[PDB]
Write a protein that binds this ligand. Structure first.
Ligand SMILES: N[C@@H](CCC(=O)N[C@@H](CSCCN(CCCl)c1ccc(CCCC(=O)O)cc1)C(=O)NCC(=O)O)C(=O)O
Ligand SMILES: N[C@@H](CCC(=O)N[C@@H](CSCCN(CCCl)c1ccc(CCCC(=O)O)cc1)C(=O)NCC(=O)O)C(=O)O
Ligand SMILES: [Ca+2]
Ligand SMILES: [Cl-]
Ligand SMILES: [Cl-]
Lengths: 209, 209
């Protein structure tokens, strides 16, 4: 295959791009990095920002999960129908990235002490996405416009992991709830989500979710 | 156009996009929001993610600083020559964003106790950008390719604020040092950087830098 994903054995910041690749019927290779191989130091020192994921598209070596998403969004036509839609797609993805950073902080730095406050603040953090859906064809299609974008796969992942963290958190958000059901039912994506390559990886690397 | 920037009276997350507009000879309106006006709650409630900056481009309203940069990048041709370069531009911008988030965390949440460790870690955080320069025309043009991109304005701002936090932090990095001097001397940008509109705003909102 022309694509390779280089990452720890976790869903994490590769879950959305994997969903995108599977739903778009693309082939790729998974190169798995163990904690031990990481600790040896050589791979880390060779990574641009000392971190994973690393992604290869032929001889193009990328880092940064959102860079990978935008690159696939460009090359596979998942980035809006025009320049204005592309901006809206970026606006959604940046909002998803902001919440994901908060989620990552909770999971890895403050799970015990922070979980109650986080879950209390969650409706206010999810509401913008419900608002975006409500303003786009009554929430019946995608997060921007009438075709899927890379921001849909990232938002979907963000919602899926939040359902595990805070079961029922989308009960307050009918359009988000229906949206998760709808996208999750896309045949190639449904198959991927049920498959061992997805199900047998943990969401995060520290046993918390 | 026309362009409107809605923000607090600080450089912060609008510095790069202002540098971009000035350097590109664009006109814009600053809509300054005071802390007092923000605390009233009304503008905040109307903001997609309850935050500034907000940006207007004719009938298009955007939020998210990097969405604004990418939109200006796309519409003004500051996004590399092709898709491969666009990906590289995103990779640089996402690395700038990661370090900006670290800088913001330090400034706003942990300056006194955290500055020493931050400054000790700083060389390892800047080196990737020196490495990128070294791999592109010997560092003699821009961060990606042969034309300026939105990532250059964001990296330039990141470098400038880091020189204030940690004077001498570029001294070990000749390509970054030369790059800052070169970009800063571009006539319109030089004029902007010297102007009261830039000089008489604080970098951050809490008196720290
Ligand atoms: N802005 C970047 C951020 C990427 C990022 O933050 N990557 C981190 C986080 S990667 C996911 C967390 N992680 C690394 C911890 Cl050091 C990790 C996750 C899963 C496993 C395996 C599972 C272990 C288990 O379940 O017990 C091991 C490590 C990383 O590479 N850490 C290594 C380092 O900085 O030295 C992006 O968006 O790509
Ligand atoms: N991912 C987003 C992040 C945007 C963001 O973090 N914006 C914040 C940070 S804006 C800069 C910090 N700030 C707001 C703190 Cl209430 C602020 C900064 C400067 C001043 C005035 C300066 C006073 C002075 O020292 O002279 C007032 C507020 C914001 O709007 N906060 C307000 C809120 O959430 O209610 C993006 O990139 O745009
Ligand atoms: Ca150009
Ligand atoms: Cl992660
Ligand atoms: Cl800021």
């Amino acid at each position: 295959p022309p694509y390779t994903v280089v990452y720890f054995p976790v869903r994490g910041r590769c879950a959305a791009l994997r969903m995108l690749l599977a739903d778009q019927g693309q082939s790729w290779k998974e190169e798995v990095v163990t904690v031990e191989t990481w600790q040896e130091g050589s791979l880390k020192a060779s990574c641009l920002y000392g971190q994973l994921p690393k992604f290869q598209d032929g001889d193009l070596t990328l880092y940064q999960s959102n860079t990978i998403l935008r690159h696939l969004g460009r090359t596979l036509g998942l980035y809006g129908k025009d320049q204005q839609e592309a901006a809206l797609v970026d606006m959604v993805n940046d909002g998803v990235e902001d919440l994901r950073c908060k989620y990552i902080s909770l999971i890895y730095t403050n799970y015990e002490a922070g979980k109650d406050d986080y879950v209390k603040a969650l409706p206010g953090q999810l509401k913008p996405f419900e608002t975006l859906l409500s303003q786009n064809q009554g929430g019946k299609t995608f997060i921007v416009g009438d075709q899927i974008s890379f921001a849909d796969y990232n938002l979907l992942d963000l919602l899926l992991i939040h359902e595990v963290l805070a079961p029922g958190c989308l009960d307050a958000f009918p359009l988000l709830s229906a949206y998760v059901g709808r996208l999750s039912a896309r045949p190639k994506l449904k198959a991927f989500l049920a498959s061992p390559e997805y199900v047998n990886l943990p969401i995060n690397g520290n046993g918390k979710q």
